Coordinates of C-alpha atoms in Angstrom, one line a residue:
Chain A
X1 CA -3.4 10.3 -14.4
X2 CA -0.1 10.9 -12.7
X3 CA 0.6 7.8 -10.7
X4 CA 1.9 9.0 -7.3
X5 CA 1.9 6.6 -4.1
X6 CA -0.8 7.4 -1.6
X7 CA -3.6 8.7 -3.9
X8 CA -7.1 7.3 -4.3
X9 CA -8.3 5.0 -6.9
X10 CA -11.7 3.1 -7.1
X11 CA -12.1 -0.6 -7.8
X12 CA -15.2 -1.5 -10.0
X13 CA -16.9 1.9 -9.3
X14 CA -17.2 0.9 -5.6
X15 CA -14.4 0.4 -3.0
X16 CA -11.5 2.8 -2.5
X17 CA -7.9 2.2 -1.8
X18 CA -4.6 4.1 -2.3
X19 CA -1.7 3.5 -4.7
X20 CA 1.4 2.0 -3.2
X21 CA 4.2 2.4 -5.8
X22 CA 4.9 2.9 -9.6
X23 CA 6.5 -0.2 -11.0
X24 CA 7.2 -1.6 -14.4
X25 CA 7.3 -5.2 -15.7
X26 CA 9.1 -4.8 -19.0
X27 CA 7.3 -2.3 -21.2
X28 CA 4.2 -2.5 -18.9
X29 CA 3.4 0.3 -16.4
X30 CA 1.9 -0.6 -13.1
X31 CA 1.5 0.0 -9.4
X32 CA 1.6 -2.2 -6.3
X33 CA -1.4 -2.1 -3.9
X34 CA -3.1 -4.4 -1.6
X35 CA -4.6 -7.8 -2.6
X36 CA -7.9 -7.3 -0.8
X37 CA -8.6 -4.2 -2.8
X38 CA -9.6 -6.0 -5.9
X39 CA -9.8 -9.3 -7.8
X40 CA -8.0 -10.1 -10.9
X41 CA -9.3 -7.9 -13.8
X42 CA -11.2 -5.5 -11.6
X43 CA -11.2 -2.0 -13.0
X44 CA -9.2 0.7 -11.3
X45 CA -10.2 4.3 -11.9
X46 CA -8.4 7.5 -10.9
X47 CA -10.7 10.5 -11.0
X48 CA -13.4 8.9 -13.0
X49 CA -11.1 7.6 -15.7
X50 CA -10.1 4.0 -16.2
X51 CA -6.4 3.6 -15.6
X52 CA -5.9 -0.2 -15.6
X53 CA -7.1 -3.6 -14.3
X54 CA -5.9 -6.0 -11.5
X55 CA -3.2 -8.2 -13.1
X56 CA -2.6 -10.5 -10.1
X57 CA -3.3 -10.6 -6.4
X58 CA -3.0 -12.8 -3.3
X59 CA -5.3 -12.3 -0.4
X60 CA -5.7 -13.7 2.2
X61 CA -2.5 -15.7 3.0
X62 CA -0.6 -12.6 1.7
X63 CA -2.2 -9.3 0.9
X64 CA -0.6 -8.1 -2.4
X65 CA -1.7 -7.1 -6.0
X66 CA -0.4 -5.1 -9.0
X67 CA -2.5 -3.1 -11.4
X68 CA -1.3 -3.0 -15.0
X69 CA -1.9 0.4 -16.4
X70 CA -2.7 1.7 -19.9
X71 CA 0.4 3.4 -21.3
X72 CA -1.2 6.8 -21.1
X73 CA -0.4 6.7 -17.4
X74 CA 2.6 8.7 -16.2
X75 CA 4.5 6.7 -13.6
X76 CA 6.3 8.8 -11.0
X77 CA 8.9 7.9 -8.4
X78 CA 7.0 9.9 -5.6
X79 CA 4.7 9.3 -2.6
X80 CA 2.3 12.1 -1.7
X81 CA 2.8 14.1 1.6
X82 CA 0.3 16.9 1.6
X83 CA 1.2 19.2 -1.4
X84 CA 4.7 17.8 -1.2
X85 CA 6.3 14.5 -2.3
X86 CA 8.9 12.0 -1.0
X87 CA 11.2 10.6 -3.8
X88 CA 11.4 6.9 -3.9
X89 CA 15.0 5.9 -3.9
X90 CA 15.0 2.1 -3.4
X91 CA 13.6 -0.7 -1.3
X92 CA 16.1 -1.3 1.5
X93 CA 14.1 -2.9 4.3
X94 CA 14.3 -1.0 7.5
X95 CA 14.7 -2.7 10.8
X96 CA 12.4 -2.6 13.9
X97 CA 12.9 0.6 15.7
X98 CA 13.1 2.6 12.5
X99 CA 10.9 5.5 11.8
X100 CA 8.6 5.1 8.9
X101 CA 5.7 6.9 7.3
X102 CA 2.7 6.0 5.2
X103 CA 0.5 7.7 2.8
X104 CA -3.1 7.1 1.9
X105 CA -6.3 8.8 0.7
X106 CA -8.0 8.8 4.2
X107 CA -5.6 9.8 6.8
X108 CA -2.9 11.4 4.5
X109 CA 0.8 11.1 5.4
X110 CA 1.4 9.7 9.0
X111 CA 4.7 8.5 10.6
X112 CA 5.6 6.2 13.4
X113 CA 8.1 3.4 13.9
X114 CA 8.3 -0.2 13.0
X115 CA 7.3 -2.2 16.1
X116 CA 7.5 -5.8 15.0
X117 CA 7.8 -8.1 12.0
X118 CA 6.2 -11.3 10.8
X119 CA 2.8 -10.7 12.4
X120 CA -0.3 -12.8 11.6
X121 CA -3.4 -10.7 11.1
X122 CA -6.5 -12.9 11.6
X123 CA -8.9 -11.2 9.2
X124 CA -12.5 -12.3 8.8
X125 CA -11.5 -13.9 5.4
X126 CA -8.4 -15.8 6.7
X127 CA -5.1 -15.2 8.2
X128 CA -2.5 -13.1 6.4
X129 CA 1.0 -13.9 7.6
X130 CA 4.4 -12.1 7.4
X131 CA 3.1 -8.6 7.9
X132 CA 5.2 -5.9 9.5
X133 CA 3.6 -3.8 12.3
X134 CA 4.3 -0.1 12.7
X135 CA 2.5 2.3 14.8
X136 CA 1.8 5.1 12.4
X137 CA -2.0 5.5 12.2
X138 CA -4.2 4.7 9.3
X139 CA -7.9 4.4 8.4
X140 CA -10.4 2.6 6.1
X141 CA -9.3 3.8 2.6
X142 CA -5.6 3.7 3.2
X143 CA -5.1 0.1 2.1
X144 CA -2.6 -0.4 -0.5
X145 CA -0.9 2.9 0.2
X146 CA 2.8 3.4 0.6
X147 CA 4.9 2.8 3.7
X148 CA 8.3 4.6 3.1
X149 CA 11.2 6.0 5.2
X150 CA 11.9 9.7 4.9
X151 CA 15.2 8.7 3.2
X152 CA 13.0 7.3 0.3
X153 CA 13.2 3.5 1.0
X154 CA 9.9 1.8 0.0
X155 CA 8.9 -0.6 2.7
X156 CA 5.5 -1.9 1.7
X157 CA 1.8 -1.4 1.2
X158 CA -1.0 -1.0 3.8
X159 CA -2.8 -4.2 4.8
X160 CA -4.9 -3.6 7.9
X161 CA -5.3 -2.0 11.3
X162 CA -7.1 -2.2 14.7
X163 CA -9.8 0.1 13.6
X164 CA -12.0 1.9 16.1
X165 CA -15.6 3.1 15.5
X166 CA -14.4 6.3 13.8
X167 CA -12.9 4.2 10.9
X168 CA -9.3 4.8 11.9
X169 CA -6.7 4.2 14.7
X170 CA -5.5 7.9 15.0
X171 CA -7.6 8.7 18.2
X172 CA -5.7 6.1 20.4
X173 CA -2.1 6.4 21.6
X174 CA 0.7 5.0 19.3
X175 CA 1.4 2.4 21.9
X176 CA -2.0 0.9 21.1
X177 CA -1.9 1.0 17.3
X178 CA -1.2 -2.1 15.3
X179 CA -1.0 -0.9 11.7
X180 CA 0.2 -3.7 9.5
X181 CA 1.7 -3.7 6.0
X182 CA 2.8 -6.2 3.4
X183 CA 6.6 -6.1 2.7
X184 CA 7.4 -4.8 -0.8
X185 CA 10.4 -7.1 -1.7
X186 CA 8.4 -10.4 -1.9
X187 CA 5.7 -8.7 -4.1
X188 CA 8.5 -7.3 -6.3
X189 CA 10.2 -10.6 -7.0
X190 CA 7.0 -12.6 -7.2
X191 CA 5.7 -10.5 -10.1
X192 CA 9.1 -9.6 -11.6
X193 CA 8.4 -5.9 -11.0
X194 CA 10.9 -3.1 -11.0
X195 CA 10.3 -0.1 -8.8
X196 CA 10.4 3.3 -10.5
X197 CA 12.9 5.6 -8.6
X198 CA 14.1 9.1 -8.8
Chain B
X1 CA -7.1 -6.1 13.1
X2 CA -9.2 -5.7 9.9
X3 CA -8.1 -5.4 6.2
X4 CA -9.0 -2.2 4.2

């Protein structure tokens, strides 16, 4: 499978999430995603085929994980945006006020701005702290997907949102959306990952 | 907010 940020993958033939970013740890191929998507050694599949297993994760507290892939996988420095792609250039953290987009298998590519940092989400399982809030919309399925500026700076991975009964927060004004994501840098240094860039 |  070509590993592109934003595409669907299943965890143990059951939940769905979206790929955040192609990374490497030494000779190992991987991708960052959300911690709540799978437990360590859960099987990721992309299009029926097994692509890898959860190597590590932290959820709740944080919401982060990486999936080590079999070497058959083709890591790519892109994030899906319809039939187009955004090249991943680096991981400079953008500031509040900045415009940012996100990609996932449910709502596709959506943009908005970063509204606040260091938010605590109080999920049913426990608090997850240090999340950044943006107001681009998202839906169930989008977790783990890429948040990225149009200039190609990888920001993070989808954690959670204020979901309405249609499974997403795209039918309410941006002013009311609280879409939260886990910052990429801490995940990257914590697992000793290097982001694939183009 | 709910995780996903």
